[PDB]
Design a protein around this nucleic acid. Structure first.
Ligand SMILES: [Mn+2]
Ligand SMILES: [Mn+2]
Length: 425
DNA sequence: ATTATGACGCT
């Protein structure tokens, strides 16, 4: 009872830009704003592959990983913006720079963990304590939370429901106890409203956010009310929320492990996990996953918000699917040089912006007909930022997968070059 | 033939 810690020590938010690549292109091209539109890579094969979809387009059924020509069959008015192409490949530079704008704003409020190009986690515990002291017992007004949903409320028109739920939550709030977890989440959400307002002011970009006591719940909350809304998931709301949450919806259970949880244990929803002892879960899924599942199904996760705004690796990848697979020495050399040239550009920019050099070069390839996504992965030294040297070294390091007797066999369906092992410069 | 990345765990 008194000693069963409930993992309410922290306030953690997950901020995620709504259809990020689409918004970047819509800021740049006003003709796309408030339209069904999507961002694509390439244009020859089936119109190109969609990697980002506006909410207007989603309402027609357009999804990521779908061909533009098929999307156009669901949504004939769909507008398309194309990723930049450089040295024969997709170049995501515009979005990395837009991402950095956003990250730098978020960093003004608290320490952030860049979790992907369009989303970051925030540790708000210190910010909330400071702010709670600043109120000096003053109660929290609904006006401070204009886009916040309280998950699980109301109990017992869309905006009408939102406001009822918020009213229930705020009426039930104990503003004098500077140590109540629910008060702390609430103040955290006020700060997140401010962060999202500053992001929109200063970039034009809208985002959603989740506010809870840990990373997994913050992330799950962020998705409950998209777009341009934020959702507070309290400790108390976990039992009902999880009672019908499919296991696959939780971060890291979306794949094979989640499928084996479902199959082995004979269950469907996160909440069912509570009925198993910790040892039972560790037995089925190993000691780490077992402890983690035993606490997660109760709303408790201890993974910290890492103070890391910048990517830990810088990578360059191109698939050569179908009949485009690389089959000669000349071909493999030229594409390794194109990849190495983009990598050199990004690395030099990184060294100047962020005072660090990479020291290790990772070369990965896929060969045709190989089941694996990485047919091979080998590392060598990365000593100077020179594309000719990096491409030569990647060759040097992969060339003994050629089984020919100036040809290349098995032909390569993927090249990948990744700079890693960063050291302060 | 949806692709381009990137974190992290296992061994
Ligand atoms: Mn997003
Ligand atoms: Mn998405």
């Amino acid at each position: 009872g008194p000693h069963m810690a409930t993992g309410q020590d922290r306030v953690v938010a997950l901020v995620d830009m709504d259809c990020f690549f689409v918004q970047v292109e819509q800021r740049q091209n006003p003709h796309l704003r408030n339209k069904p539109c999507a961002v694509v890579q390439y244009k020859s094969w089936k119109g190109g592959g969609i990697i980002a979809v506006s909410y207007e387009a989603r309402a027609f059924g357009v999804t990521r990983s779908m061909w533009a020509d098929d999307a156009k069959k669901l949504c004939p008015d769909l507008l398309l913006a194309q990723v930049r192409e450089s040295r024969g490949k997709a170049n995501l530079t515009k979005y990395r720079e837009a991402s950095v704008e956003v990250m730098e704003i978020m960093s003004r409020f608290a320490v952030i963990e860049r979790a992907s190009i369009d989303e970051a986690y925030v540790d708000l515990t210190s910010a909330v304590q400071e702010r709670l002291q600043k109120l000096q017992g003053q109660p929290i007004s609904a006006d401070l939370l204009p886009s916040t949903y309280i998950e699980g409320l109301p109990q017992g028109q869309k905006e009408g429901m939102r406001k009822q739920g918020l009213f229930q939550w705020l009426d039930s709030l104990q503003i004098d106890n500077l140590t109540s977890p629910d008060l702390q989440l609430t103040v955290g959400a006020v700060i997140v409203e401010e962060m999202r307002a500053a992001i929109e002011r200063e970039t034009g970009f809208q985002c959603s956010a989740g506010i809870s006591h840990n990373k997994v719940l913050a992330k799950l909350a962020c998705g409950l009310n998209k777009p341009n809304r934020q959702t507070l998931v309290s400790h108390g709301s976990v039992p009902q929320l999880f009672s019908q949450m499919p296991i696959r919806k939780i971060r890291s259970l979306g794949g094979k492990l989640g499928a084996s949880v479902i199959e082995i244990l004979g269950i469907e929803y996160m909440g069912e996990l509570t009925q198993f002892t910790e040892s039972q879960l560790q037995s089925h899924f190993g000691e780490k996953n077992g402890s983690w599942l035993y606490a997660m199904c109760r709303g408790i996760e201890h993974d910290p918000v890492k103070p890391r705004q910048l990517p830990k690796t810088i990578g360059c990848s191109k698939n050569f699917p179908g009949k485009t697979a690389l089959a000669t020495r000349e071909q493999v050399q030229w594409w390794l040089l194109q990849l190495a040239q983009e990598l050199e550009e990004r690395l030099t920019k990184d060294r100047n912006d962020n005072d660090r050099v990479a020291t290790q070069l990772v070369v990965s390839i896929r060969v045709q007909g190989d089941k694996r996504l990485s047919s091979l992965r080998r590392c060598c030294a990365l000593t100077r930022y020179d594309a000719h040297k990096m491409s030569h070294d990647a060759f040097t390091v992969i060339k003994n997968c050629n089984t020919s007797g100036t040809e290349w066999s098995p032909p390569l369906t993927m090249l990948f070059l990744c700079a890693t092992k960063f050291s302060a410069s």
